[PDB]
Amino acid sequence: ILNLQNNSAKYNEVHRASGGAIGQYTTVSKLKDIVILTTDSLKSYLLDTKI
Amino acid sequence: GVYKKKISDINVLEEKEMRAMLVDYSLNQLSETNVRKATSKEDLASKVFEA
Amino acid sequence: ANTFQIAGIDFTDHVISFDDLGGVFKVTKEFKLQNQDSIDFLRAYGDYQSQ
Amino acid sequence: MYEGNNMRSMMGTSYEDSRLNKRTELNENMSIDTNKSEDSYGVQIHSLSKQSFT
Amino acid sequence: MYEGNNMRSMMGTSYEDSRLNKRTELNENMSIDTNKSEDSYGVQIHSLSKQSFTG
Structure with missing residues (x-):
């Protein structure tokens, strides 16, 4: 999550899109926009072990 | 005293019989998608926390 | 802790x-009462109706 | 462009998009009110109620 | 609905209800104010009283 909110051409898959094979596309994310997706078991493993 | 024990035994038999009924329900009544398999008492606390 | x-x-x-x-018991096979000390043991807990 | 008389039956009025009646809305809250275990600590033990049915 | 008399000792005025006294309740508290393990943390002994318990 600390990677994604830097100015980088990485971390996207715009090379799978049409014109994105050559050239560059840099982007960021706002951290009010990133959401993560796991199980509820890993949610429990957060809420009991680390935090 | 015999009157108060003849009302207290009502309480203890009612809680014991109803405890018996939901434990008896917790065997041989509900299917394998409900039941999960733990292994220890130092397990089954994480497993109830994800449960 | x-x-x-x-x-x-x-979540306690x-x-x-x-x-x-x-502490409870459930009959699955059917039968009849023959032993006299069984009658005394039942009415030791108050089951006087049993003959 | 075509004028005609665009008022017609239920299919003639459907293409100007009949009114949004229900909303398949989230009023029972999933992942806000529910999916929480962040609200349990205090020692005020077993004060829970069985509601009735309908 | 039917008016009748409604009167007998039992099965009239005894068939539909009786006087209620007590529903075999929790007054001695299990798992609310007793079944406690939530006690203090400090200097210690003598929370141990004795009644006569003769009745």
């Missing part, structure tokens, strides 16, 4: 807990 910040996590308010989860 052994962990540090669980300020909304401690929903824990109905007993010393042992069984």
